[PDB]
Amino acid sequence: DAEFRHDSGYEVHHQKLVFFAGDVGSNKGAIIGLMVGG
Amino acid sequence: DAEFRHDSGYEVHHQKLVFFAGDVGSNKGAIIGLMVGG
Amino acid sequence: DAEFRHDSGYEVHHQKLVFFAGDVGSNKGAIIGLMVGG
Amino acid sequence: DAEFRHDSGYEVHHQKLVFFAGDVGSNKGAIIGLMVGG
Amino acid sequence: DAEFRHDSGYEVHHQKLVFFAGDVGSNKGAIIGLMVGG
Amino acid sequence: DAEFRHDSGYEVHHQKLVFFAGDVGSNKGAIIGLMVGG
Amino acid sequence: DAEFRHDSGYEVHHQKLVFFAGDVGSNKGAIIGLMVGG
Amino acid sequence: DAEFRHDSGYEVHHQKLVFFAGDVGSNKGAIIGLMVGG
Amino acid sequence: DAEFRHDSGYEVHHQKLVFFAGDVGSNKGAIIGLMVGG
Amino acid sequence: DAEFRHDSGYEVHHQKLVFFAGDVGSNKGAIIGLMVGG
């Protein structure tokens, strides 16, 4: 007579002027805010 | 008669002018705010 | 008759002008705020 | 006259009988290999 | 006269009997190999 | 008749003008605030 | 006349009978190999 | 009839103009505030 | 005339019967190999 | 005319029957090999 209960909790996010909001599992590419050449 | 209860807690985030908000599992790429060349 | 209870706690974050807010499991890439060459 | 060169390197992975192979940016859910109740 | 070159590298993966092969950006759901109740 | 209770505590963070706010499990890459060459 | 060169190195991984192979940026959920109740 | 209770305590952090706020498990890479060459 | 060169080195990992192989940036959840109740 | 060269060195790891192989930046959760109650 087992009982398995899981709750992921309450998440509230307030964000302003955020370039990258989020979780990246794996990153091998390029993440650049601004690129100026020449 | 076991009882398994898990709670991930309450998360509140307030962020302003944040380039990268988030959790990266693994990072092998490039994360640059600004790139100026020449 | 065991009881397993886990709570991840209450997390409140207030951040302003933060380049990188977050937890990195493993970092082998480059994390640079600003790159100027030439 | 700047030169920006980035290389993410050579990655070779050999895995056998691995439940979870991969990078998780953020984890708030449940990751259980086996669940038995009652 | 800037030059921007990015290479994500060579990735070779050999996997056998792997339940979950891949990168998860964010996980709030349930990932269970086997569930047995009653 | 055992009882297992775990609480991760209350975490409050106030941060302003912080380049890198977060916990790094392992760091082999480069973390530079500003790079000027030439 | 600056030159920016980054290399993430050579990574070789050989793993057998590994429950969780990978880097987790942030973990607030439950990671259990086996759960038995009742 | 054992009782296991763990509490991680109350953590309050106030930080301003902090380059690196956080705990590093292992560091083999470079952490430099400012790099000027030439 | 500056030259910036970074190398993350050569990493070889051989692992057998390892529950958790990987780097965790921050851990607030539960990581248990085996849970038996009742 | 400066030259910046960084090398993270050669890392070879051989591990067998290791519960937790890896570097944890910050730990506030529970890491238990085996939990038996009742």
Author numbering:
A (entry chain I), B (entry chain G), C (entry chain E), D (entry chain H), E (entry chain J), F (entry chain C), ...: 1 to 38
What does the primary publication say about this deposited structure?
Mutations identified in familial forms of AD (FAD) indicate a causal role for the amyloid precursor protein (APP) and presenilin (PSEN1/PSEN2) genes, which encode the precursor of Aβ and the ɣ-secretase enzyme that catalyses the final step of Aβ peptide production, respectively. ɣ-Secretase produces Aβ peptides that vary in length, of which Aβ1-40 and Aβ1-42 are most abundant. These animals have a humanised mouse App gene containing three familial Alzheimer’s disease mutations (Swedish, Beyruthian, and Arctic).
To identify amyloid pathology within fresh tissue, mice received an intraperitoneal injection of a fluorescent amyloid dye, methoxy-X04 (MX04). To rule out the possibility that MX04 altered the structure of the in-tissue fibrils, we also determined the structure of fibrils purified from MX04-injected AppNL-G-F mice using single particle cryoEM, revealing a structure that was indistinguishable from unlabelled β-amyloid. The backbone conformation of the Aβ peptides were arranged as two ‘S’-shaped protofilaments that form an extensive inter-protofilament interface. The ordered core of each protofilament contains residues 1-38, compared to residues 9–42 in type I and II wild-type Aβ1-4213. In both type I and II fibrils formed from wild-type Aβ1-42, E22 is surface exposed. However, in Arctic Aβ1-42 fibrils, which only differ in the E22G mutation, G22 is buried within the fibril structure, at a point near the intra and inter-protofilament interfaces. Thus, it appears likely that wild-type Aβ would be unable to adopt this Arctic Aβ amyloid fold because of steric clashes created by a Glu at position 22. Alignment of available Aβ1-42 structures from post-mortem human AD brains, and the two distinct Aβ amyloid structures from AppNL-F and AppNL-G-F mice, indicated that residues 20-36 form a very similar structure in each fibril (1.35 Å and 1.31 Å Cα RMSD AppNL-G-F with Type I and Type II fibrils, respectively). This conserved structural motif adopts different positions with respect to the fibril axis and the interface between symmetry-related protofilaments, giving rise to the different amyloid structures observed.
